[PDB]
Amino acid sequence: KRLN
Amino acid sequence: KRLNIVEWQPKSIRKCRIKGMLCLFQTTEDRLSYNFDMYEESIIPEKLPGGGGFSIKNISLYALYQEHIHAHNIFTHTNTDRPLARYTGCSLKFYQSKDIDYVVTYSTSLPLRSSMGMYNSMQPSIHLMQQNKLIVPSKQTQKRRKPYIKKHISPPTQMKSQWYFQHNIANIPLLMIRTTALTLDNYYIGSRQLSTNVTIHTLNTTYIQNRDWGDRNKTYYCQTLGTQRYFLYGTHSTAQNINDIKLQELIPLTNTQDYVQGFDWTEKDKHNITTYKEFLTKGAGNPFHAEWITAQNPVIHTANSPTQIEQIYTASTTTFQNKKLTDLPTPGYIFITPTVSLRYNPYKDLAERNKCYFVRSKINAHGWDPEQHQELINSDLPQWLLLFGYPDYIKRTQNFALVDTNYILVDHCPYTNPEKTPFIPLSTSFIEGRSPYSPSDTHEPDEEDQNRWYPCYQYQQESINSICLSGPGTPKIPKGITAEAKVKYSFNFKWGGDLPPMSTITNPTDQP
Amino acid sequence: IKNISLYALYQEHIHAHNIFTHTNTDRPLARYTGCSLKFYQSKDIDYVVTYSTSLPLRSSMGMYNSMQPSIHLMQQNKLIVPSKQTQKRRKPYIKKHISPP
Amino acid sequence: ESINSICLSGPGTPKIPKGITAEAKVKYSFNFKWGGDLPPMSTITNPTDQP
Amino acid sequence: IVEWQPKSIRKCRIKGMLCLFQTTEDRLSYNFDMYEESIIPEKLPGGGGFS
Amino acid sequence: KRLNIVEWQPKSIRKCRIKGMLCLFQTTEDRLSYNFDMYEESIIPEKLPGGGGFSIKNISLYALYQEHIHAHNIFTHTNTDRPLARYTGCSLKFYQSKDIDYVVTYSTSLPLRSSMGMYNSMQPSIHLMQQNKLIVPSKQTQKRRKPYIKKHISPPTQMKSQWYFQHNIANIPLLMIRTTALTLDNYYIGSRQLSTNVTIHTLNTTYIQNRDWGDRNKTYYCQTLGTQRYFLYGTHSTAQNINDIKLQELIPLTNTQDYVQGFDWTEKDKHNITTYKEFLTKGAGNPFHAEWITAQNPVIHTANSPTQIEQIYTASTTTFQNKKLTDLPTPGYIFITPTVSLRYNPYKDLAERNKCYFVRSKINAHGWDPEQHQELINSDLPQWLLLFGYPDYIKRTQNFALVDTNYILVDHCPYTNPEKTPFIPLSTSFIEGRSPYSPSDTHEPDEEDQNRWYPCYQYQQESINSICLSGPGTPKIPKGITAEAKVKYSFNFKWGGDLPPMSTITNPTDQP
């Protein structure tokens, strides 16, 4: 979904 | 080894939900195959209550600000003194329309571009087959617990969770919505009447090829073969034999730019005509007038130039009475119709040699071959899919001079029962002597269409819409009804900055 | 009476009436697993369906007479689809899975 | 050839017989991912296919 | 800092073989380029002993 | 709902492992780019100790029986009275060769066919890049614990575990093995000597185009332009100026089919010649003789036909002494060489307009354009990859008349430093007047190559092998050494049937  | 990238949060932060309503399309049946823009090419809304049956919308923070100038949205918090923005995503609520169903699909690939395959894939049956579609039935086709379908859309993958200056992200398109109008219950029949076959009108390709249109300063000639020029003449004569018609009966065509019928040499004394030169200028007929366009009154095609007829008249006016179509110079006098009507059946179409392109209407160039942009040629789809949104892809591409009067749409299709090598589709309104979207009670163009009364894309529009309406999924809309669709949006932002200034009001002079 | 074959499905793809979720251009083997049908309620008309998968395909005089709406409605393993007018439903379609021949 | 001969006087420089070419190679594997929205695709007739 | 992963992803290993040098004794002090100054490979079987 | 398919096992069953040894290739350096067949086109093994540096092997139970007739395998159990077979798979042991490395890959897709991309992908560098390769280093490049690599191969997916009649499965190919000869330690240099550039000989395309080869019954002419024919003449003259050479000095060419040099008119009295007609028949030179092929002694190109020279001689033999190349009919006397030498560099090749095809050598057709099979044209790969195995793909395709003498290989390549529009590669042996694979101490063709001494694929073979040897991964093999590779196979079968009959031997007359 979302990553650092 | 590797570290997370980290940002330091700004000193003051204010959440803002930009909330509002967006029109997806508003359409009549005669506009279903066209793209709806709410902000128009200024002729489109003149006597049309809906401009198009599909749209592609791009949404950006600047477009959201422009919708706030139209009062179409609210900003839950102002942004005046916080210059940073942090976009978090969108919520859409798609509402069931009363009378029409519709397919939506959306994208957030930050790279924004248009494609010929995208515009063809807007065809309602093709769009309804795509993955990650949303179908919204009308309230008539399905009653539901919730009258809307709601979904959340994440930012573009290129828009990271970081803060950005609002000046930088203002024009970045953060959402694309694609919508097309549909019927589920009339999917095959659509708006068909009587036979499955649709009738297409076209310009005879085998005689009308010179494309020298839209001047009163040029005697019109329909084709060149070898070194020759060929010419058309109207007559009201009851004569059964092409040989015995007089040199007088013929009404020569010296204009294409007007709706004017011309008149016969028997009206010489009504227009104070002294010579065949004044008969040519006052009395010549435009070949596209409502009786000459389909030869309701006979029309004669010949190699014999009007200037050879001028020489016969001017050499002696008394022998112009005596001379007939017999013993004339180059006398290829035949009976030819400028229009032919084809029958098209969509179920008989196999798309093996189908093709479609635009050619320049106002230029001095012969023939109909694909010319100019060869990358804009659209091929190998059935005509109801091949034509769908293709004119709007071409307009949005801007590789042609924009005005409908300066181009013609030309298409090849093996699958009409009669044939012409290319087809030059023409709308029933132009075949009946009426403005492009004018009601049938009218029997003349309006003044701006009385000018420029010659073959061009502006007069083709209803014919290619009618071919697209032969395709599956296309809706049935009663005449005088406009179908509409809307979404309610909520874009989620934060505004960031250092603390802003503020001001205050006197206590005594305040809400009493 | 409709007969469906993989070649008829390819012909419907030439009419743009279907999608293939994956192309077959360079994989010459096929392994058919069965079909799902969703039959939709029409707006104005009801209709009886029945289907078969006996690999032997043929037509008969008794088959064509048995298409008469009253006779077809009496047959076993019919499906009746009422119009939206004759019955409002939770799901606007009837769905069933059909095994290979 | 004279400045090559001066460099050959320096340490570590190899001895290669005349008419022999010495060579070295590496095998590489660069690791990438490609990203995008879903692409289009096309298909082949069943009757005219690998028989 | 966080990124949102793209809709479709496809791993690709670009695999191959690279020549590090090909040299004779009379070219040891020179840089090997495989794509040449067009005179260098004329009557030399190896262009350089380092790269 | 669904059931497993079940078979009833036959009354008697006998396991049989067909065990043996298969040659993968046996090659010299001058055969590396060609397919090894152990059972030959009968000319190939004549004075070649190894036929090819790659192979494609198909194995079937009938091919295993044919290898038993050569005594190359054993059957662990006979099949004489059990007609059913149940194939279970194969074990292969690939042995390290002493002197050469090699890549293997194998397939069991029951559908068996050949492809142009398959034969190009046999190139050692390309095959070494493929997935599911096996690399076998030589004993020199790597010492190993086990001197072989062993792997088990399952039946074709179409060959199920069921019993089959041996008559039905006999010809079904149950394994394909693809092998190519390689070097890992000489991967880039290969067998390069001196410069990276390789020299290619070719027929001048701008003068040699008529392709009317291999008759002593036809006066040869090299090109036609407009209505004209152009002709070649040899001379031993020391004359520096093309204008002053006599009509006598020229040695006209009336044959292409022979190795013969011809002779000068000064030898009239050695061959009892009475006329220029007898000089034409006895003394004419073939343009491809070892001195005329590269014009070691000068060669003259002209529009002036030998029959115009016949008319000058026969009209008066005394003025044939007086007449020079000045004031002759159509005198385009120039100095032209039938051969040019190009330089090719593989690292300078970008494959943007590379192309390759075969044209008919023994036909009366002008020019070099791609002709006949347009699907056999090979394009857009670097010449060392484009040529690799392409002649063998064409031979195995059988779409051309099979004999090397009846076709020429023609290729386009922008990347030679000098250029010719097509190239007609020719081997150094044909450029030096020697048989296709004959040792350089020889200075004449053998009798069967003294006949048919004209441009054809049989004389091109070593030149296209030399271009393939410029490509990476191609091995270095010393002259007079043949490199070889072998696999040991074990195919696993069962034989099935009803119980067979048997016979017995007397006890008294038996092993004493």
Coordinates of N, CA, C and O in Angstrom, one line a residue, chain F residues 132-210:
Chain F
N132 N 17.3 -22.4 -18.3 CA 17.4 -23.9 -18.3 C 18.4 -24.5 -19.3 O 18.2 -25.6 -19.8
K133 N 19.5 -23.7 -19.5 CA 20.7 -24.2 -20.1 C 21.4 -25.2 -19.1 O 21.2 -25.1 -17.9
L134 N 22.3 -26.0 -19.6 CA 23.3 -26.7 -18.8 C 24.7 -26.4 -19.5 O 24.8 -26.6 -20.7
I135 N 25.6 -25.9 -18.7 CA 27.0 -25.6 -19.2 C 27.8 -26.8 -18.7 O 27.9 -27.1 -17.6
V136 N 28.6 -27.4 -19.7 CA 29.6 -28.5 -19.3 C 30.9 -27.9 -19.6 O 31.3 -27.8 -20.8
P137 N 31.7 -27.5 -18.6 CA 33.1 -27.1 -18.8 C 33.9 -28.3 -19.3 O 33.7 -29.4 -18.8
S138 N 34.9 -28.1 -20.1 CA 35.9 -29.1 -20.4 C 36.7 -29.5 -19.1 O 36.7 -28.7 -18.1
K139 N 37.4 -30.6 -19.1 CA 38.3 -31.0 -18.0 C 39.4 -30.0 -17.8 O 39.9 -29.9 -16.7
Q140 N 39.8 -29.4 -18.9 CA 40.8 -28.3 -18.8 C 40.3 -27.0 -18.1 O 41.0 -26.5 -17.2
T141 N 39.1 -26.6 -18.4 CA 38.5 -25.3 -17.8 C 38.0 -25.6 -16.3 O 38.1 -24.7 -15.5
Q142 N 37.6 -26.8 -16.0 CA 37.2 -27.1 -14.6 C 37.4 -28.6 -14.3 O 36.7 -29.4 -14.8
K143 N 38.3 -29.0 -13.4 CA 38.3 -30.3 -12.7 C 37.2 -30.4 -11.7 O 36.9 -29.5 -10.9
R144 N 36.5 -31.6 -11.8 CA 35.3 -31.8 -11.0 C 35.4 -33.1 -10.2 O 36.1 -34.0 -10.6
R145 N 34.6 -33.3 -9.1 CA 34.4 -34.5 -8.4 C 33.9 -35.6 -9.3 O 34.5 -36.7 -9.4
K146 N 32.7 -35.4 -9.9 CA 32.1 -36.3 -10.9 C 32.4 -35.7 -12.3 O 32.2 -34.5 -12.5
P147 N 32.9 -36.6 -13.2 CA 33.3 -36.1 -14.5 C 32.2 -35.9 -15.5 O 32.4 -35.7 -16.7
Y148 N 30.9 -35.9 -15.0 CA 29.7 -35.7 -15.8 C 28.7 -35.0 -15.0 O 28.7 -34.9 -13.8
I149 N 27.7 -34.4 -15.7 CA 26.5 -33.8 -15.1 C 25.3 -34.7 -15.5 O 25.1 -35.0 -16.6
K150 N 24.5 -35.1 -14.5 CA 23.4 -36.1 -14.6 C 22.1 -35.4 -14.4 O 21.9 -34.7 -13.3
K151 N 21.1 -35.6 -15.2 CA 19.7 -35.2 -14.9 C 18.7 -36.0 -15.6 O 18.9 -36.6 -16.6
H152 N 17.5 -36.1 -14.9 CA 16.4 -36.9 -15.3 C 15.3 -36.0 -16.0 O 15.1 -34.9 -15.6
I153 N 14.8 -36.6 -17.1 CA 13.9 -35.9 -18.0 C 12.6 -36.6 -18.0 O 12.6 -37.8 -18.3
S154 N 11.5 -36.0 -17.7 CA 10.1 -36.6 -17.7 C 9.6 -36.8 -19.1 O 10.1 -36.1 -20.1
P155 N 8.6 -37.7 -19.4 CA 8.0 -37.8 -20.7 C 7.4 -36.5 -21.2 O 7.1 -35.6 -20.4
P156 N 7.2 -36.3 -22.6 CA 6.4 -35.3 -23.1 C 5.0 -35.2 -22.4 O 4.4 -36.2 -22.1
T157 N 4.5 -34.0 -22.2 CA 3.2 -33.8 -21.5 C 2.1 -34.6 -22.2 O 1.1 -35.1 -21.6
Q158 N 2.2 -34.8 -23.6 CA 1.2 -35.5 -24.4 C 1.3 -37.0 -24.2 O 0.4 -37.7 -24.5
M159 N 2.5 -37.5 -23.8 CA 2.7 -38.9 -23.5 C 2.3 -39.2 -22.1 O 3.1 -38.9 -21.1
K160 N 1.1 -39.7 -21.9 CA 0.6 -39.9 -20.5 C 1.2 -41.3 -20.0 O 1.8 -42.0 -20.7
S161 N 0.9 -41.6 -18.7 CA 1.5 -42.8 -18.1 C 0.8 -44.1 -18.6 O 1.3 -45.2 -18.3
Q162 N -0.2 -44.0 -19.4 CA -0.9 -45.2 -20.0 C 0.0 -46.0 -20.9 O 1.0 -45.6 -21.4
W163 N -0.4 -47.3 -21.2 CA 0.1 -48.1 -22.2 C -0.2 -47.6 -23.6 O -1.3 -47.2 -23.8
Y164 N 0.7 -47.8 -24.5 CA 0.5 -47.5 -25.9 C 1.1 -48.6 -26.8 O 2.1 -49.2 -26.5
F165 N 0.4 -49.0 -27.9 CA 1.1 -49.9 -28.9 C 2.4 -49.3 -29.4 O 2.5 -48.1 -29.7
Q166 N 3.4 -50.1 -29.4 CA 4.8 -49.6 -29.9 C 4.7 -49.1 -31.3 O 5.6 -48.3 -31.6
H167 N 3.8 -49.6 -32.1 CA 3.6 -49.2 -33.5 C 3.2 -47.7 -33.6 O 3.6 -47.0 -34.5
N168 N 2.3 -47.3 -32.6 CA 1.8 -45.9 -32.5 C 2.9 -44.9 -32.1 O 3.1 -43.9 -32.7
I169 N 3.6 -45.3 -31.0 CA 4.6 -44.4 -30.4 C 5.9 -44.4 -31.0 O 6.8 -43.6 -30.7
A170 N 6.2 -45.4 -31.9 CA 7.5 -45.6 -32.5 C 8.2 -44.3 -33.0 O 9.4 -44.0 -32.7
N171 N 7.5 -43.5 -33.8 CA 8.0 -42.2 -34.4 C 7.7 -40.9 -33.6 O 8.2 -39.9 -34.0
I172 N 7.0 -41.0 -32.5 CA 6.8 -39.8 -31.6 C 8.1 -39.3 -31.0 O 8.7 -40.1 -30.3
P173 N 8.6 -38.1 -31.2 CA 9.8 -37.6 -30.7 C 9.7 -37.4 -29.2 O 9.0 -36.4 -28.8
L174 N 10.3 -38.2 -28.3 CA 10.1 -38.1 -26.8 C 11.2 -37.2 -26.2 O 11.0 -36.9 -24.9
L175 N 12.2 -36.7 -26.9 CA 13.2 -35.8 -26.4 C 13.8 -35.0 -27.5 O 14.2 -35.6 -28.5
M176 N 14.0 -33.7 -27.4 CA 14.9 -32.9 -28.2 C 16.1 -32.5 -27.3 O 15.9 -31.9 -26.3
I177 N 17.3 -32.7 -27.8 CA 18.6 -32.1 -27.2 C 19.1 -31.1 -28.2 O 19.4 -31.4 -29.4
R178 N 19.4 -29.9 -27.7 CA 20.1 -28.9 -28.5 C 21.5 -28.6 -27.8 O 21.6 -28.4 -26.6
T179 N 22.6 -28.7 -28.6 CA 23.9 -28.6 -28.1 C 24.7 -27.6 -29.0 O 24.6 -27.7 -30.2
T180 N 25.6 -26.8 -28.4 CA 26.5 -25.9 -29.1 C 27.9 -25.9 -28.5 O 28.0 -25.9 -27.2
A181 N 28.9 -25.9 -29.2 CA 30.3 -25.9 -28.8 C 30.7 -24.4 -28.4 O 30.3 -23.5 -29.1
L182 N 31.5 -24.3 -27.4 CA 31.7 -23.1 -26.6 C 33.2 -22.9 -26.2 O 33.9 -23.9 -26.0
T183 N 33.7 -21.7 -25.9 CA 34.7 -21.5 -24.9 C 34.4 -20.5 -23.9 O 34.0 -19.4 -24.3
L184 N 34.6 -20.8 -22.6 CA 34.5 -19.9 -21.5 C 35.7 -19.0 -21.3 O 35.6 -17.8 -21.1
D185 N 36.9 -19.5 -21.4 CA 38.2 -18.8 -21.2 C 38.6 -17.9 -22.4 O 39.4 -17.0 -22.2
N186 N 38.1 -18.2 -23.6 CA 38.4 -17.4 -24.8 C 37.2 -16.7 -25.4 O 37.1 -16.5 -26.6
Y187 N 36.2 -16.4 -24.5 CA 34.9 -16.0 -24.9 C 34.8 -14.8 -25.9 O 34.1 -14.9 -26.9
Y188 N 35.6 -13.8 -25.7 CA 35.7 -12.6 -26.5 C 36.7 -12.8 -27.7 O 36.4 -12.5 -28.8
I189 N 37.9 -13.2 -27.4 CA 39.0 -13.3 -28.4 C 38.7 -14.4 -29.3 O 38.9 -14.3 -30.5
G190 N 38.2 -15.6 -28.9 CA 37.9 -16.7 -29.7 C 39.1 -17.3 -30.4 O 40.1 -17.6 -29.7
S191 N 39.1 -17.2 -31.7 CA 40.3 -17.5 -32.6 C 40.8 -16.4 -33.4 O 41.5 -16.5 -34.4
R192 N 40.5 -15.1 -32.9 CA 41.0 -13.9 -33.5 C 42.5 -13.9 -33.6 O 43.2 -14.3 -32.7
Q193 N 43.0 -13.4 -34.8 CA 44.5 -13.2 -35.0 C 44.7 -11.7 -35.4 O 43.9 -11.2 -36.2
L194 N 45.7 -11.1 -35.0 CA 46.0 -9.7 -35.2 C 44.8 -8.7 -34.9 O 44.4 -8.7 -33.7
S195 N 44.3 -7.9 -35.8 CA 43.2 -7.0 -35.6 C 41.9 -7.7 -35.2 O 41.6 -8.8 -35.6
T196 N 41.0 -6.9 -34.6 CA 39.6 -7.4 -34.3 C 38.8 -7.5 -35.6 O 37.9 -8.3 -35.7
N197 N 39.2 -6.7 -36.7 CA 38.5 -6.7 -38.0 C 38.8 -8.1 -38.7 O 39.9 -8.5 -38.8
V198 N 37.8 -8.7 -39.3 CA 37.9 -9.8 -40.2 C 37.7 -9.3 -41.7 O 36.9 -8.4 -41.9
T199 N 38.4 -9.9 -42.6 CA 38.3 -9.5 -44.0 C 37.3 -10.5 -44.7 O 37.5 -11.7 -44.7
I200 N 36.3 -9.9 -45.4 CA 35.3 -10.6 -46.2 C 35.6 -10.4 -47.7 O 35.7 -9.2 -48.1
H201 N 35.7 -11.4 -48.5 CA 35.8 -11.2 -50.0 C 34.4 -11.2 -50.5 O 33.5 -11.8 -49.8
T202 N 34.0 -10.4 -51.5 CA 32.7 -10.4 -52.2 C 32.8 -10.2 -53.7 O 33.7 -9.6 -54.2
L203 N 31.7 -10.6 -54.4 CA 31.6 -10.3 -55.8 C 31.2 -8.8 -55.9 O 30.2 -8.5 -55.3
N204 N 32.0 -8.0 -56.7 CA 31.5 -6.6 -56.9 C 30.1 -6.6 -57.3 O 29.8 -7.4 -58.3
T205 N 29.2 -6.0 -56.6 CA 27.7 -6.0 -56.9 C 27.5 -5.0 -58.1 O 26.6 -5.3 -58.9
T206 N 28.2 -3.9 -58.2 CA 28.0 -2.8 -59.1 C 28.4 -3.2 -60.6 O 28.2 -2.4 -61.5
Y207 N 28.9 -4.4 -60.8 CA 29.3 -4.9 -62.1 C 28.9 -6.4 -62.4 O 28.5 -6.7 -63.5
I208 N 29.1 -7.3 -61.4 CA 28.7 -8.7 -61.6 C 27.3 -8.9 -61.1 O 27.0 -9.1 -59.9
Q209 N 26.3 -8.9 -62.0 CA 24.9 -9.1 -61.5 C 24.0 -10.0 -62.4 O 23.0 -10.4 -61.9
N210 N 24.5 -10.5 -63.5 CA 23.6 -11.2 -64.4 C 23.3 -12.6 -64.0 O 22.3 -13.2 -64.4

